[model samples]
Target: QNLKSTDRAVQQMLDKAKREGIQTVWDRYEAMKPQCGFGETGLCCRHCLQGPCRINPFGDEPKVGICGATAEVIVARGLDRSIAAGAAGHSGHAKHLAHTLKKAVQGKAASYMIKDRTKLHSIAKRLGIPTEGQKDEDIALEVAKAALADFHEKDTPVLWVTTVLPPSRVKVLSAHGLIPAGIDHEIAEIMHRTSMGCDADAQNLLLGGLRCSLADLAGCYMGTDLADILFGTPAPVVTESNLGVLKADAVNVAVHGHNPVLSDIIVSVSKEMENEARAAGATGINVVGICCTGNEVLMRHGIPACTHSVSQEMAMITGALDAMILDYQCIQPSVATIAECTGTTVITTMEMSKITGATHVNFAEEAAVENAKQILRLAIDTFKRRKGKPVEIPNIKTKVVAGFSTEAIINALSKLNANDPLKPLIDNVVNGNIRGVCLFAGCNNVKVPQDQNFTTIARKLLKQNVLVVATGCGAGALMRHGFMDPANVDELCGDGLKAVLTAIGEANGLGGPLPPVLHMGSCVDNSRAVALVAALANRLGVDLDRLPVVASAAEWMHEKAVAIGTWAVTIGLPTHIGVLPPITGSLPVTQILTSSVKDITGGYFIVELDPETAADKLLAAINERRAGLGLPW
Candidate 1:
């Protein structure tokens, strides 16, 4: 499918954007055509009030800024800033959950409780907190306290980062001065070092960037673990995706935010409010999801996804969304304008993220029980008042087998080998029955045709026998387009991968091939993929970079994705980015990122604009790693 037909839902909405004379992201992008060359290449710098400077990538315009910073130094500083920003996003999310958990365990939060006692105990044991004969809340308190301590540690690296990575990998990172001391410490250091003339060494700036990314990895791990403890780990679940999941007769509410706290309560309250919807002349409350909120519920409750980042408003375009409840992160403000036209109530639930003219619900965990029901009632009431004409949901959806948590994956493998759970997957890799693994992630960019790179590169890799796993908006992209459909394993995968998927599917009693791509959960759940790779690396007694594995955010446009990709490289996986990043203006900075970082971290980045070329490059990197491991390529 080309851009015009890549997604029927998107296409239909884009057409709506045109016919109604309403603006969309595409229109905004067109308005800013020929986007800044200096910014794109990371040549521009405005770090201090003394200068808003840029260096010419081509010729003869000032080679250095007014502050005498070269492109190399400027670009490294810009990148370091981005890495810190990304780390803060995840760290803030983790902090909120950790705080909520602490309150819950202390009995201060009236509406919150330990939903997954097993996970609480498991995390407590991992943190060296005693769980022997202790109550679940007691252990959960210790776990939450331990988690909070990681953010405030002074001399030591974040506990979870050190605890999760192999000691060998830790040693490697320590040797390079890339082991982050604490989440807050590293993020603050990036801000300090990137200040004007404080530290101009390009290499050192990049090293700081790596340290901040490690903090991001720690935050992501904690976010995932805390979320699981609070709201059960996911297992295989069937769901539908795309706009078609919205119902014309029902009160369709798309939960469109990141965290599981408010979204989870909404899912529970929807059932209780169905009668209210019917009383308002609606069939029932149909709650579809969007972005990571969608991923969170889809993994556990099998809530269907309506769309991802770039296409969020397009979900409104279907004219069936009575309301979209947003918590925080990646919820577009533009959806507010769209809602005004469509009679959709855009409810902002978080105290931190409020848009003008949007309904503010002030979601408190203590009041979640009543708050959720009130929100549902608002949607039901909005459904009765919706005057937008002729809601047309595009007939587009596909079955998705989501929720491939690390435990679920291992359980599936365990059915193949009762004695050694990982041996079956390892054996396939060793014997060349499976080529490698690739984790697809990141947000959608307006520059790339939405979901095109993800779908195109994924098909190429699957045909090359690579096992694909997705998270965040990339998973949303794949799900919306049927890449996670099980039948695609036979349709798109090479003979080698098809055989392996079928074997695993049969062992799991699916009676068919597993999907070519595995949906591993929300963006925060990228940690799960890392956990899987770490487990395999430990089993083989090798570093992660030695394994034939890679990661790519083919059309990434988020700062968070940049931080995640940096950590992927720092953790010794060849990471790919299909869209152009900001460092192309500085030759030294670009060289260090694409080539020289390998010397320090045993992994690096490769930027290829074309998805097909990027796939070939990733395969080449995988083969090189395979040869190093003495495995067949």
Candidate 2:
């Protein structure tokens, strides 16, 4: 049980759960060991009832599916579907934010107002919506309408995708026919084409998947953009992480899942309900975060993240948590069971995502504040029963400095060279003060010991002078291990990287070096990394593919990670995944993904499960790009 996690807090909870006969994600993973070979290799096909056909892994009989679909076709189809599902998830999230913004501008959502009018106007201008001499509400309405318009089958390409990327990169995508017509159109196309009696050509299917992955990128970009407009754009903020963030004497409410729509309001409403919590024999209402939602609030409001990803249950295992309020995605149903054993209330919001055992609170944008207050009241009432109960709160946490949005990063660098913010960073890259940039994104897989791959690869990269930025659970993992604490820069980062970080920190009045790893935000905010790179490419008069940058999701588990990684590759970066994706059944499909795709997109997947070796490969990829640009490797 202890070996199941690197986190001492998680190890302690795992031990306790075992002693108390409470099954956990690790236990379930163990039970599911030696899992289906066909499914593992992406040979299983259930697209149509014609069969749940699976090709035999061993070279025996049944080489192809009943529908005469070859292994390559089957694998490519499965991959396309995964990309489509991921695109849908992210696009749906962005659409929700767009609706909320529309409601806010229309004076329907009283709880929300335009928090960043500058961002609203900027986005409006970028989308070709005239914002000059326009009211914020009218501009926001136009922006919201534009966001909604991007989802359907439009005559033009996705505005979010076309606008965010550099011109040369956009030309490459357009030349390859990789630009998405619309976010939802590509998703629906994948579903239709992957169905029975259609799109059997393996290479054609893969190309369609690439197009859909670009749609996923558009969704993520809009999600971040609209969220910054609704809530304020995130700047650097100080926070904490780990299960230790749960307060024993407070109504500790853990906000789990990805979307920040309601979670942002909950953060505000929690502060307002402190007196109510205090009246219930608690010190106050302490709102902590779990996964991406935690990252969202942590980035903006400095809310401490209690735990993340596979170890989310560890928060409830602390027994100090009075409530676990969930939005959607990355939320395990087992959390409800864990809550029952721990005497915690599990509240599920959103009409589409609800657990059978959890309490459902239908969340609407119009009554956002009152809905948030109601959720807090439920948590406070739960605190009343949980008060004075013997709880095992972990004594583990680390100081975290997060909220490195593209604007915030530019603001910091502008302090160094106000006239040319990107020049300072570009100079460092050219001078070898910073070797290259690596963005770590995605979730923690139960198959990998929680946070092990993330920490291992990050340590190797940081020590090698690779400037690192993290999002989602990757940030959570690094922060928990002190990677997001400035004091560790001396130990974790190479001299060159440390010097650059120190200079930036002092310039920004941080008094010391910035954290070894910069926390850019949640999963959706991977767009922040893209935006920064686009600026660099624009400033250097080069295409994105020529940059010495790489991306990795070392222990990814979600389909969203799949879509994100695909787009990372599509946008011209050497993308790495520590876990083996399920395309190994077909050598052609695997070869195309890992090698041949790079010839076209200037990016490819590197499948190396060993973190140390993965780091080496990533560095080599970066060095190759640097050499292409006549820079020192």
Candidate 3:
């Protein structure tokens, strides 16, 4: 089993799953594959409770919601909801951070402290507050108070620091009603607004979402309170990955979720799991993470992360999951149900996400160490319950290159800071060798074939030697399917790109290890690409439009991705979407988004459904942008 998916591995995984009676998602995938006609045209919507709306402006505006909303309204509402879902998760996470910081401010949080005093003090200055004039405790207290205020602080927080977009784009969002409010509140607003009988006006729905989108930037950075201190200003760090990391001879423990509270303890305690594993008849302990949880520990301690969102199932298919420990949201309580399909045991630590069949280990943050020790012991004991053989692991995997963040990417371009900064990075992109950067992201929707959109697009792109940068669950999709391993990059990559992978691998001395598709942290982290794109633009002394950057929500099933996409387009990037964002059915609306919208901002938004075509289209679009800029392609 190479730690990546190859043609041979696919057949092997299929055979293994069948032989072991493992009901992989293949069945569910078939049932949910996208409908060619509707999916490709971006002409489908059924979000409202009333009438599963399906619009085709070219056919007839009859594809309308019961509230007399047209295809445009439907599509816009869908976009609004996508942003809302994203905000909901991110806000929830930020809320916990806010709560943790509150305790830290009060000096009650002995376990965590504000790490980045500069980032903390900088934010303290923004809210018209003072850090210079006050002590650190006072600043943290005041900072916490200001950040807490952003949630319900009675103001929009998106552009609190500065307008990352152009003046015209900011005005358009305001004019279009795409503003967000309290992060949680705007998401709640969308749910309330888009309900069967709510604000039937689609434009109003999306406008409200813009408010939600801005709420996070306003919340997280303004406080920038504890994370920088505790997490250590996030930098590019190396971590290994995949189900292959699991062991038949050791206790295998998987930690999932976004928050680091419990995981902070859990990851450290794995060293103890090794001691416990020996007592339970094993040699060592194996622990990894999933989703942003992976990014969390990986960033701090440099542990391997398994996958995000959808890949949870594929990891389980490895059949070696001893304890699938979970903390907060981003977890699918459904993975507990997957136990009926596989032997892997699912465990839940947070009270909110307890699974029926999984063991329960409560992660009381204050008592983190003791709780983690208890979990460690339990996982070790479970490992002994299994037979002599290793679990049926999937043979499929792929290698990928990861670790380009906005900060990191920009920092790397310091060399380009020369008199003509534009000359260097833009050159490789022009030749079509670097191909283009792919904003491969979004959650897995069972509505379409499982990974059909994401997988097909990734495979197609890799074949062309295009660089793929992924985050959130979509990144996990690549990881679980073996796309992110660095060792395998050369095998799957087109000849043009294979040379680069080999050079990096040889330089890193990972000649035999599986390389990976670039894996960024979580959904909140798709912003890494945005930062990279923007930083590149700034370095080149050009607006983002001239860069070989393209974004796609290949199977985008959430409002947050839409909010992200909206911001991407607003900032002058080509955004290609896979799923039908409910609005495409409107002629004037589609025209505005596809043709005229680029005029409003500097970027364009188009939807392509066929997974392979979506990947190919993104690459082709990048080449076209390069040609426009007199770059290589």
Candidate 4:
């Protein structure tokens, strides 16, 4: 009843760890049972040293913080700080990519170049950057400059936010003063406002949160756009997933974390250093992914993914894994401890995100190729020492067809209608052949059974004819469960969706239907889902609120998930989150987020934990939008 995951591979690893007395995330989670109620309900405040105030949830003596802050104010402030932190995380990732692209264009980074000039040109044109006679490298420099500029405060709105959203949606956001002036500006403002006694008005605090969330959206979009320009836009790719991707005879190096900066180089350099791995008594160097870093390479290069989110440590438990290379975000420090037992080398590459007890390899874009080669060599040397050790590796894996970027989706659609790519998709939605679209974006939580919410909700929606697109660990969960397998389309999809997928698959020259769930890259590539919906809204000449689209992060755990979900709501999509957020202590804040806020943003939260009920709510939201457009439900 208390199983850690549905994946057999993860289960096998967990069993091995248990037998060896190696504690994992699930064990830590169990130890943390009955967490602080004040924190859980967002009733605690620790902004200033004046006090770590706890507002009693029950009708008691302490009804307010020491600072005289009410429950609503405390909850709203906590939520605002979360949004700011989330914005910082995503914007930091985008900033890294922007710097990398800048270096590549300036000829400082010889190993990196503009891999998708078409995407560069397209982004430049969208940002209104002139590119008539300039070299591609020069154009990319200007684009990178533009991206960096958007982070600071400016008179103009953040270009990525304004340019990417539909015009009418922009009008709505502007009317509410929700459009961020800049990414870093909003983040700073949130930090300032959420501090001790700065902004006490709950409503005003929430408004600030919405604005900061939009900054997160800008940063996310910039990350995706710049990454594509630097490392080529992802297209359809065939890959395998789960622990089985780790080999007994090969040197397995698992790339973990969010950014593609060093990980992408590592993927390329692994090929160059294959002989080194061979000479170290291995067949070759096998680079697998963990978490979003895995998703990044899996989409672009068809690299297999070992595991994600809560199950990250399970990959290290697979004794066949030689090394786990990490960049930043979603990486567990416990991995370093696990590596000590399994003979796996845990290497942290980012200067800002170093883990104690882990080996450090400072990565720089200037010598990215050399840095990658060094990391591979380290893995090879470790492989040499651990070559013939007895290892527990699950012989379980799944075939996955992934990498459905917005451009790739449009390209596939254009195969059916050359002049109008979105026409096929829009026509299907209108005719009720496809009921609606749902984007699954977020991470797994230990509180819920791993992959349970994602797979359960996705299965329900897919069978109801809703087109599903997944990112981050949501994609990892689904793919591991065969949701991304084309062979499962018949069993997973409804008759209407089956026919539509078959038509598109046939048109694109695939022998069978596209997978039941479309793999849309990493968490930052939730921008791709926005692009798809914005295209539909533009083609149909409707605001996003009227479109039959919804989003779900069934088991979200990160602050980044909070920021992403808030932005999704701000963009006028009904968003579902399975885990109850900490805002439940205050009735006013809860009411605003789950209900009345829809009056302004045309979207609101649907907080349901049960997977089947959550799916029903999402489908209802989709049908409500369809009815607004007079489309058949």
Pairs clashing in candidate 2?
none
Expressed as tens digits, the lDDT of each residue in 314-392 for candidate 4 is: 8878787888898888888899888888888899988899999999999999989888888888899888888668877
The Cα error of candidate 2 at residue 255, in Å, is 0.7
Clashing pairs in model 1, backbone N/Cα/C closer than 3 A = none
lDDT of 2 by residue, 266-322 (tens): 998888888888888999989999999999999999999999999988888878888
The whole-model C-alpha lDDT of candidate 3 against the native structure comes to 0.63
Candidate 4 residues lying further than 4 Å off, grouped into runs, are none
Tell me how many clashing residue pairs each candidate has: 0, 0, 50, 0
Question: lDDT tens digits, residues 118-153, model 1?
Answer: 778777776678988888888888888777888866
Residue 410 alpha-carbon offset, candidate 4, angstroms: 0.5
Instruction: Give the lDDT of residue 458 in candidate 1.
Output: 90
Predicted candidate 3 versus true structure: per-residue lDDT over 231-254, tens digit per residue: 555555655555555566767778
> TM-score of model 4 relative to the true fold?
0.99
TM-score-best of 2 and 3:
2
Worst 10 residues of 4 by lDDT: 1-10
